[PDB]
Amino acid sequence: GSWGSMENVNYDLLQKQVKYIMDSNMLNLPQFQHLPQEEKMSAILAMLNSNSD
Incomplete structure:
Protein backbone atom coordinates (compact mmCIF):
# COMPACT_ATOMS: atom_id res chain seq x y z
CA GLY A 1 0.00 0.00 0.00
CA SER A 2 2.39 2.68 1.23
CA TRP A 3 -0.54 5.09 1.03
CA GLY A 4 0.24 8.68 1.96
CA SER A 5 -3.25 10.18 1.86
CA MET A 6 -5.38 10.38 5.00
CA GLU A 38 16.69 18.37 4.14
CA GLU A 39 14.95 19.66 1.01
CA LYS A 40 12.64 22.59 1.73
CA MET A 41 10.47 24.25 -0.92
CA SER A 42 10.61 21.30 -3.31
CA ALA A 43 9.19 19.24 -0.45
CA ILE A 44 5.94 21.17 -0.88
CA LEU A 45 6.08 20.63 -4.64
CA ALA A 46 6.79 16.90 -4.53
CA MET A 47 3.78 16.22 -2.31
CA LEU A 48 1.43 18.45 -4.29
CA ASN A 49 2.64 18.33 -7.90
CA SER A 50 3.56 14.67 -7.39
CA ASN A 51 1.16 12.14 -5.87
CA SER A 52 1.85 8.55 -4.81
CA ASP A 53 -1.40 6.63 -5.34
Whole structure:
Protein backbone atom coordinates (compact mmCIF):
# COMPACT_ATOMS: atom_id res chain seq x y z
CA GLY A 1 0.00 0.00 0.00
CA SER A 2 2.39 2.68 1.23
CA TRP A 3 -0.54 5.09 1.03
CA GLY A 4 0.24 8.68 1.96
CA SER A 5 -3.25 10.18 1.86
CA MET A 6 -5.38 10.38 5.00
CA GLU A 7 -8.88 11.30 6.18
CA ASN A 8 -7.82 13.55 9.07
CA VAL A 9 -6.29 16.55 7.30
CA ASN A 10 -7.66 18.46 4.31
CA TYR A 11 -5.55 20.24 1.70
CA ASP A 12 -8.38 21.44 -0.53
CA LEU A 13 -8.78 24.28 1.97
CA LEU A 14 -5.07 25.08 2.20
CA GLN A 15 -4.91 25.27 -1.59
CA LYS A 16 -7.56 27.99 -1.76
CA GLN A 17 -5.40 30.04 0.61
CA VAL A 18 -1.94 29.41 -0.84
CA LYS A 19 -3.26 30.11 -4.33
CA TYR A 20 -4.47 33.47 -3.03
CA ILE A 21 -1.25 34.29 -1.18
CA MET A 22 0.81 33.46 -4.26
CA ASP A 23 -0.67 36.61 -5.80
CA SER A 24 0.70 38.85 -3.05
CA ASN A 25 3.71 37.26 -1.34
CA MET A 26 4.94 34.35 -3.45
CA LEU A 27 7.61 33.73 -0.81
CA ASN A 28 9.82 30.64 -0.78
CA LEU A 29 7.09 28.46 0.73
CA PRO A 30 7.05 30.17 4.15
CA GLN A 31 3.99 28.36 5.52
CA PHE A 32 5.00 24.76 4.84
CA GLN A 33 4.02 21.89 7.13
CA HIS A 34 6.37 18.97 6.47
CA LEU A 35 9.85 17.91 5.36
CA PRO A 36 11.69 14.75 4.21
CA GLN A 37 14.98 15.50 5.96
CA GLU A 38 16.69 18.37 4.14
CA GLU A 39 14.95 19.66 1.01
CA LYS A 40 12.64 22.59 1.73
CA MET A 41 10.47 24.25 -0.92
CA SER A 42 10.61 21.30 -3.31
CA ALA A 43 9.19 19.24 -0.45
CA ILE A 44 5.94 21.17 -0.88
CA LEU A 45 6.08 20.63 -4.64
CA ALA A 46 6.79 16.90 -4.53
CA MET A 47 3.78 16.22 -2.31
CA LEU A 48 1.43 18.45 -4.29
CA ASN A 49 2.64 18.33 -7.90
CA SER A 50 3.56 14.67 -7.39
CA ASN A 51 1.16 12.14 -5.87
CA SER A 52 1.85 8.55 -4.81
CA ASP A 53 -1.40 6.63 -5.34
